[PDB]
Design a protein around this ligand. Structure first.
Ligand SMILES: N[C@@H](CCCC[NH3+])C(=O)O
Length: 247
């Protein structure tokens, strides 16, 4: 019912209704800038979300790859999870690439960021899927290579089972000497809970972030659609953490 050919109009209609209050949008922008994070319930309609979730589950079944690694560029923090890479989503999907190209979605995110939110210059980071499903699974402390990440909560357990997001904004990623523990000591951590159906926006290049490990065998699945800034387009970027976690 929802397809690459009609999803753009649905995204624009929802944004026009959901974010009609200019003062609410101003507050969302200020929260995003202050905290590096803002929750955006209803960013897409429930129907669009469900269509995107259905595609996500299909991609996981065909393509998911188990990883159990630790990355020196983020202080040897763990990535214990299963993943689907951008190449497989671009090859097999249709809805997810169409949402990623959404003029209306990028235009609303530009309002929050107060600058142009645009396509990522490295194709392989535009969108990925992670599935946490075993006790101990986690997306450990890290930064993103690009500026504007929207996380889609495709599945999530009750928060006492793990999966809470934690953030420290206004930091920076030095891959040669990331100093994760020094940042935790210098600044407070904000923790945010999410349920299935939620969406949130994250300033991934300057917000140090992670998910709290699962403490039971439960399923948490996110889609990560990652957009970029003007400055992101010309900065020299290495992709080692991306190459390590996704096919
Ligand atoms: N740099 C991230 C890779 C995933 C980013 C997704 N856009 C990390 O270290 O986990």
């Amino acid at each position: 019912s929802i397809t690459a050919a009609n999803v753009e109009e649905l995204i624009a209609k929802n944004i026009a209704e959901r974010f009609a209050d200019d003062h609410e949008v101003l507050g969302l922008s200020q929260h995003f800038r202050r905290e590096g994070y803002v929750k955006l319930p209803g960013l897409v309609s429930p129907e669009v979300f469900d269509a995107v979730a259905a595609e996500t589950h299909q991609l996981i079944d065909t393509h998911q790859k188990r990883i159990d690694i630790r990355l020196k560029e983020t202080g040897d923090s763990p990535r214990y999870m299963s993943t689907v890479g951008q190449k497989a989503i671009a090859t097999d999907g249709s809805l997810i690439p169409a949402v990623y190209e959404s003029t209306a979605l990028k235009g609303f995110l530009s309002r929050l960021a107060k600058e142009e939110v645009m396509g990522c210059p490295w194709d392989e980071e535009k969108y990925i899927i992670t599935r946490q499903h075993q006790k101990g699974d986690t997306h450990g402390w890290h930064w993103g290579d690009f500026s504007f990440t929207v996380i889609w909560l495709i599945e999530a357990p009750s928060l006492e089972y793990g999966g809470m997001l934690q953030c420290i904004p206004h930091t920076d990623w030095n891959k040669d000497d990331p100093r994760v523990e020094d940042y935790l000591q210098k600044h407070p951590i904000r923790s945010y809970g999410h349920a299935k159906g939620d969406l949130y926006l994250l300033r991934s290049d300057t917000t140090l972030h992670r998910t709290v490990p699962l403490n039971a065998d439960r399923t948490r699945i996110i889609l990560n659609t990652c957009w970029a800034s003007r400055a992101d387009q010309q900065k020299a970027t290495t992709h080692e953490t991306m190459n390590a976690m996704f096919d």
